Amino acid sequence: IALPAHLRLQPIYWSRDDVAQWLKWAENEFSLRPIDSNTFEMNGKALLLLTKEDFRYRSPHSGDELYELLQHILAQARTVFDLYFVLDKSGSVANNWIEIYNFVQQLAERFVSPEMRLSFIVFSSQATIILPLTGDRGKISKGLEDLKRVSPVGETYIHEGLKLANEQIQKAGGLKTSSIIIALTDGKLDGLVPSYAEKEAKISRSLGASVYAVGVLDFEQAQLERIADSKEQVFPVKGGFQALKGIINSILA
């Protein structure tokens, strides 16, 4: 499971009842020795004032861990959803790269806010994180300039691209954010790559993320249905901006 809705808010707004809820959720998510619901009889503000020693004093068996758990929640700030762009830059898209860039550009510019964090990942014969997971506007702007300078060449090892999104969802994802993976590609895979891509996409859904596939050029509908979570999460680029704008506006509540 994942942080409950009440806990999706910044800790500073947490009620005393929220703090108790947080403790039980943590015990299950981290297999901790159960603690009394009255181990932290205070609100979020007060919890923020406690030292790590206070946590260890109140919970000798799990206080250090709970304290660190709280730090990670704080590190997400106001983020509510993380959006990962896994972009095909193979030779097949060398004459339609601007179509891919404009698609990322419009969605990025639309949803830049303290609630959103973006990552730009490109993949061909090798994968590269162009923009690490961030919600900072200046970083997002430079990331778009880097993205416009991609020279599409190579094979289509989409599993490598999805791996770079999975790793970030493990390290920085979860907690108060829902992760979405937008793979733009034509779905023309070779050899064992289809199995690798489906295996890598299986990791993504195990991390609680939803995989969307945006078909570029004459795209392989069947393949993208095996990468994405379902048939309804596979659409072409034309209208894909309006389609994704609705699903993101929806996940915003």
Residue numbers in the entry: 3 to 255
Sentences from the paper on this structure:
We hypothesized that this crystal is formed by small domains with P65 symmetry packed with an offset of (a − b)/3 relative to their neighbours. The 32-axes polymers form a continuous interconnected framework, whereas the 65 helices make no contact with each other. We executed molecular replacement using both a version of the data set that included only the strongest 1/3 of the reflections and a version that included all reflections, with the strongest 1/3 of reflections having a different scale factor to the remaining 2/3 of reflections, both cut back to 1.9 Å resolution. Along the length of the TELSAM polymers, the 32-axis chain C vWa domains adopt a zipper-like arrangement, with each vWa domain contacting two other chain C vWa domains from an adjacent 32-axis polymer. We have identified the phenomenon of TELSAM-polymer flipping and were able to largely correct for it by differently scaling the weak and strong reflections in our data.
The ‘TELSAM’ variant of the human translocation ETS leukaemia (TEL) protein sterile alpha motif (SAM) domain is a 75-amino-acid (9 kDa) polymer-forming crystallization chaperone that is soluble at pH > 8. However, when the pH decreases below 7, TELSAM forms a six-subunit-per-turn helical polymer that can enable fused target proteins to co-crystallize.
